[PDB]
Amino acid sequence: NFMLNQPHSVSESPGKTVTISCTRSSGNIASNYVQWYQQSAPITVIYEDNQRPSGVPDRFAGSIDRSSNSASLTISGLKTEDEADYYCQSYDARNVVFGGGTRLTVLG
């Protein structure tokens, strides 16, 4: 299978843009859909690489970078409310794979 690796921490000031990356260790990041959860239980903020569920602010964006074999969650216009852990997730034909999660600290 594979693992997904993310930094544990990222920080930024309100109004600014932050990116959390999720590197896949083996295989192609493009081969399976990537979901992002914010953490109660984790809630979905991105699914199928870049789709936002109902209610999730447009400031949350998912992307895939095949060249670095990674997925990224980019949060623009950072709000205090966005402080949370964010986990990426994908699949290896059945079994769920989870990143280690990244804490977004919002400065101020």
Residues lying near its own copies in the complex (CB under 8 A) are found at: 1-3, 5-8, 23-26, 40-41, 43, 54-57, 67-70, 79-81, 100
- In the bound state with its own copies, the residue whose beta carbon lies nearer, of 48 and 66, is 66
Between CA 82 and CA 49 the distance in angstroms is 20
Q: Shortest CA distance to 34 belongs to which of 66, 77, 8?
A: 66
Q: How far is the CB of 55 from its own copies (least distance, A)?
A: 4
For residue 13, count CB atoms less than 10 angstroms from its CB and return exposed for 0-12, middle for 13-18, buried for 19 or more. exposed
Q: How far is the CB of 48 from its own copies (least distance, A)?
A: 19
- In the bound state with its own copies, the residue whose beta carbon lies nearer, of 48 and 54, is 54
Q: How far is the CB of 40 from its own copies (least distance, A)?
A: 5
Between CA 6 and CA 23 the distance in angstroms is 7
